[PDB]
Design a protein around this ligand. Structure first.
Ligand code: B12
Ligand SMILES: Nc1ncnc2c1ncn2[C@@H]1O[C@H](COP(=O)(O)OP(=O)(O)OP(=O)(O)O)[C@@H](O)[C@H]1O
Ligand SMILES: Nc1ncnc2c1ncn2[C@@H]1O[C@H](COP(=O)(O)OP(=O)(O)OP(=O)(O)O)[C@@H](O)[C@H]1O
Ligand SMILES: [Mg+2]
Ligand SMILES: [Mg+2]
Lengths: 169, 190
């Protein structure tokens, strides 16, 4: 029996948590797939470590604008990642799927809510989905079985600490 | 319009401001699921870049350690807690002994300049239940290498620790499958 897990809120740790569950699952001989809806500038350590173990990663094409005019381009691209996402949510050998930073995809109308939804509902009874990102659709939140709020009690960057490899990316 | 630049300028400035760079303390607290899991994801992220990490776990689970399994071989040392810890008052000596034992190693990692990251998993209940002295932890944290990052995990973390900590995130249980009758599972729960 898989569940839906959502990691949301402003504190640091959502993507990190999705990964640790993924790691945890990989450490149990489990099969996992990852879709990232956002293109980091930097190299991807989680990827670097897990891809070799058998973890598939589909990332968002580079140059996503976040811009109104460009919403068409910007969308195709989203819709293009969402495919792999569709695929993984239909793969029966996949014990777990990570949908990194979907939230904004739904939130800005880039990825239709219904898509995600249906895709979620129709997934393998035994498959676990972990969704992350700030501001997750109320529908999602409701469909979700587990949900955690990373309350921003404190953050290093506020104290003048630069983002650094290993911690931040 | 100019709003765009407005923000543009803001970010740039904020970013421009935060130049410091050293190892930080990170706390993962609250009742919601995700404390231990986010520490490990960060560890994992670190390894992914060649960084060196050391882990200490204050609690010994019922099942196999997926994280350990996966991370040890990459050269991530795991110092775990002995089987049979009682949470029994009657047996505080035995439990305390055990504790202090795991604590050595942690003290060790905390002292190693080679480690870029130290993970003290479920340390909160050790201090909170008096099985381990706070000043100790506070000191160790105080001495540790200046590029070393620590991540502490668990519910109900000493303010002092909270206070020393650089970033703190409290996992609020919006929802939890358990309450909904879902049982614990492999790769997920443990
Ligand atoms: C959360 C966040 C976002 C969210 C913001 C919306 C939301 N809250 O739901 C989303 C995902 C949309 C976003 C996207 C992007 N982000 Co961002 N964002 C973050 C983060 C973690 C928090 C910002 C925040 O909430 N600050 C506090 C609020 C109170 O202050 P604010 O000034 O009003 O914050 C606004 C801006 O930060 C804006 N925004 C968010 N990110 C960025 C990046 C740029 C370049 C700009 C101009 C604006 C922008 O969103 C906030 C709301 O308007 C910061 C991390 C950090 N250390 O700052 C990164 C950060 C600001 N983002 C970063 C990046 C690079 C981007 C993206 C380019 C990511 C990508 N690869 O596509 C895009 C670009 C969007 C844009 N406006 O240009 C960088 C910018 C680097 C730089 N030197 O300019 C930062 C500093 C993170 C990092 N990598 O160090 N991000
Ligand atoms: N509250 C915050 N203040 C500053 N930077 C943040 C904060 N939360 C996350 N970040 C950093 O902003 C980038 C985008 O992270 P995101 O907003 O998706 O948070 P996250 O998923 O919780 O972060 P992380 O991946 O470290 O777990 C990351 O480099 C991340 O570490
Ligand atoms: N609020 C909760 N309800 C039910 N089970 C929980 C809850 N929080 C955590 N768990 C489960 O309890 C065990 C460890 O609990 P802990 O207090 O350390 O939280 P955690 O560090 O956030 O959990 P995890 O390791 O899943 O990320 C795990 O099996 C864990 O998934
Ligand atoms: Mg993230
Ligand atoms: Mg834990």
């Amino acid at each position: 029996r898989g569940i839906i897990i959502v990691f949301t809120g402003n504190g640091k740790g959502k993507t990190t948590a999705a990964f640790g569950t993924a790691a945890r699952a990989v450490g149990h001989g489990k099969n996992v797939g990852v879709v990232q809806f956002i293109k980091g500038t930097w190299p991807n350590g989680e990827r670097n470590l897990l891809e070799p173990h058998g973890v598939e990663f589909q990332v968002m094409a580079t140059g996503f604008t976040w811009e109104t005019q460009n919403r068409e381009a910007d969308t195709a691209a989203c819709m293009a990642v969402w495919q792999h996402g569709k695929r993984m949510l239909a793969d029966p050998l996949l014990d777990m799927v990570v949908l990194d930073e979907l939230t904004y995809m739904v939130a800005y109308d880039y990825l239709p809510l219904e898509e995600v939804i249906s895709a979620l509902n129709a997934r393998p009874g035994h498959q676990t989905v972990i969704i992350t990102g700030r501001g997750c659709h109320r529908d999602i939140l409701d469909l979700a079985d587990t949900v955690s709020e990373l309350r921003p009690v404190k953050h290093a960057f506020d104290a003048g600490v630069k983002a650094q490899m290993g911690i931040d990316y």
